[PDB]
Amino acid sequence: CQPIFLNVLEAIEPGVVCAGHDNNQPDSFAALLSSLNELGERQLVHVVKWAKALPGFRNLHVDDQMAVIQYSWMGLMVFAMGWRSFTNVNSRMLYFAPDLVFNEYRMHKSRMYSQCVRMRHLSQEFGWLQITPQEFLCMKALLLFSIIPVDGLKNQKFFDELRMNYIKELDRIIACKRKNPTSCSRRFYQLTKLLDSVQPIARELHQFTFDLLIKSHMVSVDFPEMMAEIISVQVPKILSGKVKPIYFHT
Ligand SMILES: C[C@]12CCC(=O)C[C@@H]1CC[C@@H]1[C@@H]2CC[C@]2(C)[C@@H](O)CC[C@@H]12
Secondary structure (H helix, E strand, C coil): CCCHHHHHHHHHCCCCCCCCCCCCCCCCHHHHHHHHHHHHHHHHHHHHHHHHCCCCHHHCCHHHHHHHHHHHHHHHHHHHHHHHHHHHHCCCCEEEECCEEECHHHHHHCCCHHHHHHHHHHHHHHHHCCCCHHHHHHHHHHHHCCEEECCCCCCHHHHHHHHHHHHHHHHHHHHCCCCCHHHHHHHHHHHHHHHHHHHHHHHHHHHHHHHHHHCHHHHCCCCCHHHHHHHHHCHHHHHCCCEEECCCCC
16 A cells, blocks of 8 residues: 555655855855845745645635745744754754754854754754654644634635644554554654644744844845745734634643
C-alpha cells in the first residue's frame, strides 16, 4: 500500500529560496530586515503554489483559500525555517536562507533577538523530539489550517472538514510504527504541543513586522508589494483579535 498522502506532500515541498542579501557588506539593521522582507515576498510565491497543490485545498471557497494563506504564512514560514535550521546547521544558527544565516550577533542586530532565540528553541525541538521528515511535512500542512476569523470563513464547514482530514493523516503517520495506543497518544500530545508553540512566536513576529512597516520610512527598511499589503490588511486583523489561532491545548 503506497502512502499517497505523504507522496504528495513530499512532491510539492518547495525547493531552496534565496534572500538576495549582500553578505559582503557589514551587517546593518536596515539591510538585514530589508532582506528578510524580500525573502518573505519570495517565499510567499512558493507558499501559495504549495498550498494550492495540497490535497483537498481546492475544495475551499476561493476567498477562503487566499485568506488562510494570508493569515497562516508567518507560522508556516517560521516552522519551515526552524526545520531548515535543524537539518542544515543542527540549529546552531537560524537558516532563513542559504544566503541569510543568522548567528547571535545578527539576531541582536535585527532587533528581534528574543524572537530569534525562541525560533532557535523551536529548531532544537525538531532534534529533541526526533521529529521525522514525514511528521514535519504533515505538521506544516496543518499549520495552514490553524488560524481563522472569529466571524467565520465563507464556507467554514469545508474548512473544518479539510482540517479534520489532515489531523486524521497525522494520526496515521503516528500509528505507522506504533502498535501501542498509549505511545500514539503520547506522540500526538508532543506534536500538538509543538504546533501550539508556533503560534505565540508568530504573534510576536506579527507585532514586530506591523510596527516596523508603520515606521519603515524612518528606519530605511524596504517592504515589497505583497508583504506591505498583507501586513497592513491581514496582519492587523490578527493583532486586533478578529482572527485567532486554533490551539489544541489551553
Ligand atoms: C517570514 C520570514 C521570512 C521567511 C523565513 O524563513 C522566516 C522569517 C521569520 C521572520 C520574518 C521573515 C519575513 C519578514 C519579516 C516579517 C520582518 O518584517 C520581521 C519578521 C520577518
